[PDB]
Amino acid sequence: KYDWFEFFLNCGVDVSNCQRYTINFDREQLTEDMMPDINNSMLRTLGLREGDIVRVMKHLDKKFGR
Numbered sequence: 001k002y003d004w005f006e007f008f009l010n011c012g013v014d015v016s017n018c019q020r021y022t023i024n025f026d027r028e029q030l031t032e033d034m035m036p037d038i039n040n041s042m043l044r045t046l047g048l049r050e051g052d053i054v055r056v057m058k059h060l061d062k063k064f065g066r
Contacts, residue, residue, distance in 0.1 A: 002032045011059045013052050021048060036064055 004025045008018040024046050030038075038060055043053045060066075 011055045013055060017052055
């Protein structure tokens with residue numbers, strides 16, 4: 001099972017939100033292979049705060065060379 005908590009922490013998300021977002025990603029069946037498909041709309045659907053959407057997308061864009 002993918003460690004979403006570590007991923008959010010590495011994005012600079014605050015520890016409380018890391019817990020909440022991990023619960024949500026796990027429940028909603030998000031996996032590592034889906035990371036290239038993640039966009040702002042989806043993160044908003046998954047309940048991320050606007051600041052955290054920015055942080056996570058900045059990380060993913062850097063990861064995937066965008």
